[PDB]
């Protein structure tokens, strides 16, 4: 059972980026893989706890829409190993290379993302950092959600007001995840990052926090169905308790997706 990987088995290739506490590379281990390494010398005791948490959470997950955890290693450097997703993150498609998807496809990405979140929530995992950067579109047709510095039982911008204005012990909850999901529905349906006409991050954080600013839902593609626009507003509720949980979101998308081809 134990998912540890003996030194030297794993080969490290292209540096590709960063993620919650570490650098990400393309590697090879029984095929090619994603490797998240924390590559210092002595590991922090705090990062030691952070590393052991993502691993703990990942080895709890087995689902198409969740980035497949494959293994970990400690020697030489602490490293998580997951499947390689060819293609790119949803963020990358939408805001960098500008892949223009179609509504049927965009709705599908929405459903699959909703799918993995229900699973996550069913097994009592809270992501606390859902955003299009963390949604990889593998072979350009399957969504894998994947970054897990988070809880069981700054990218702004996807943060609910409650999270923004850290007033109380635990702001993070199922509803905050639901909120983040809402911003992703926004990016899919508008093709934009929200608040693109404010050029000041502080002002963005201050106002979302006080409930002065909210995503401008009038910006959505005209062929985006009514029910989808309707669903987004519900997800983006300023009041935590006023948001629907993921089962309900999933039934919503499934319904509108079914009566869409026309
Ligand atoms: O938490 C994690 C995040 C990533 N991020 C992955 C990235 C990536 N791309 C750009 C910047 C950062 N990461 O590309 C990938 C391709 N296939 C799989 C995973 C990734 C990888 C592993 C872990 Cl364990």
């Amino acid at each position: 059972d134990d998912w540890e990987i003996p030194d030297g088995q794993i080969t490290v290739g292209q540096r590709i980026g960063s993620g919650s506490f570490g650098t990400v590379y393309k590697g090879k281990w029984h095929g090619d893989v994603a490797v998240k390494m924390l590559n210092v010398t002595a590991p922090t005791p705090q990062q030691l706890q952070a590393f052991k948490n993502e691993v703990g959470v990942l080895r709890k997950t087995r689902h198409v829409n969740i980035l497949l955890f494959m293994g970990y290693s400690t020697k030489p450097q602490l490293a998580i190993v997951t499947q390689w997703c060819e293609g790119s993150s949803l963020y990358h498609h939408l805001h960098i290379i500008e892949t223009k998807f179609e509504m049927i496809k965009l709705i599908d990405i929405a459903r699959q993302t909703a799918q993995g979140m229900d699973y996550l929530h069913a097994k009592s995992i809270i992501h606390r950092d859902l955003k299009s950067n963390n949604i990889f579109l593998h072979e350009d047709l399957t969504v894998k959600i994947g970054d897990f510095g988070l809880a069981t039982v700054g990218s702004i911008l996807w943060m609910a007001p409650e999270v923004i204005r850290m007033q109380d012990k635990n702001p993070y909850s199922f509803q905050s995840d639901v909120y983040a999901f809402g911003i992703v529905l926004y990016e899919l349906m508008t093709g934009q990052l929200p608040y693109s006409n404010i050029n000041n991050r502080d002002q963005i954080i201050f106002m979302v926090g006080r409930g002065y600013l909210s995503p401008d839902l009038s910006k959505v593609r005209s062929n985006c169905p009514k029910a989808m626009k309707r669903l987004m507003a519900e997800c983006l509720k300023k009041k935590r308790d006023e948001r629907p949980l993921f089962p309900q979101i999933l039934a919503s998308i499934e319904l509108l997706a079914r009566s869409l081809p026309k």
Side-chain angles (χ1 to χ4, degrees), residues 110-124:
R111 197 207 85 249
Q112 292 192 64
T113 310
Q115 191 51 87
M117 287 305 313
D118 198 12
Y119 181 84
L120 279 182
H121 282 187
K123 297 181 100 85
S124 205

Side-chain angles (χ1 to χ4, degrees), residues 21 53-54 57 120 125-129 147-152:
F21 338 121
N53 250 71
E54 184 168 7
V57 168
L120 279 182
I125 291 108
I126 310 161
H127 194 288
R128 307 163 73 194
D129 201 36
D147 202 315
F148 297 87
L150 59 83
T152 177

Side-chain angles (χ1 to χ4, degrees), residues 40-239:
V40 196
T41 23
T44 321
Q46 250 201 29
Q47 276 173 322
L48 217 313
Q49 178 62 49
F51 169 76
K52 230 82 190 64
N53 250 71
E54 184 168 7
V55 169
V57 168
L58 280 169
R59 84 198 260 4
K60 280 232 73 168
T61 48
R62 282 178 161 264
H63 183 282
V64 266
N65 296 128
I66 309 299
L67 184 76
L68 175 57
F69 167 80
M70 273 183 185
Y72 71 85
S73 90
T74 57
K75 306 99 92 300
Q77 305 135 12
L78 316 86
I80 296 156
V81 169
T82 73
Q83 79 181 121
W84 180 260
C85 292
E86 194 53 42
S88 278
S89 78
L90 192 46
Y91 181 92
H92 193 254
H93 280 279
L94 255 30
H95 318 300
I96 309 306
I97 70 174
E98 313 204 66
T99 296
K100 217 160 137 43
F101 294 102
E102 296 175 46
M103 201 50 59
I104 301 72
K105 225 286 180 75
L106 295 158
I107 280 154
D108 196 46
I109 293 157
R111 197 207 85 249
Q112 292 192 64
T113 310
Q115 191 51 87
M117 287 305 313
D118 198 12
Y119 181 84
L120 279 182
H121 282 187
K123 297 181 100 85
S124 205
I125 291 108
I126 310 161
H127 194 288
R128 307 163 73 194
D129 201 36
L130 221 206
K131 58 182 162 162
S132 49
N133 286 294
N134 287 330
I135 300 160
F136 310 96
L137 227 210
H138 161 252
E139 290 308 67
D140 292 338
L141 46 88
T142 315
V143 156
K144 322 274 175 163
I145 293 158
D147 202 315
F148 297 87
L150 59 83
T152 177
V153 109
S155 47
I156 51 171
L157 197 63
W158 288 270
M159 271 161 65
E162 8 133 3
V163 175
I164 294 269
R165 70 177 112 87
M166 269 228 194
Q167 105 95 131
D168 72 46
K169 273 205 278 181
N170 221 67
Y172 298 97
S173 99
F174 293 151
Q175 282 85 345
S176 66
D177 269 8
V178 176
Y179 179 89
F181 179 81
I183 294 306
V184 357
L185 289 185
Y186 180 89
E187 314 183 71
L188 285 171
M189 300 300 109
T190 62
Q192 300 200 240
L193 286 167
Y195 332 126
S196 320
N197 63 138
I198 301 163
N199 292 99
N200 185 293
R201 174 188 142 101
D202 309 333
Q203 291 295 334
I204 294 158
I205 114 153
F206 168 64
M207 282 161 126
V208 171
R210 296 266 260 253
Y212 296 153
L213 217 213
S214 61
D216 175 22
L217 268 51
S218 76
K219 201 106 61 80
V220 293
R221 281 180 172 75
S222 54
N223 60 169
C224 173
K226 292 281 204 194
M228 179 58 74
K229 207 174 178 159
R230 203 168 319 117
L231 175 73
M232 231 167 305
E234 301 282 56
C235 286
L236 292 176
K237 282 309 165 188
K238 296 182 154 80
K239 315 280 305 301

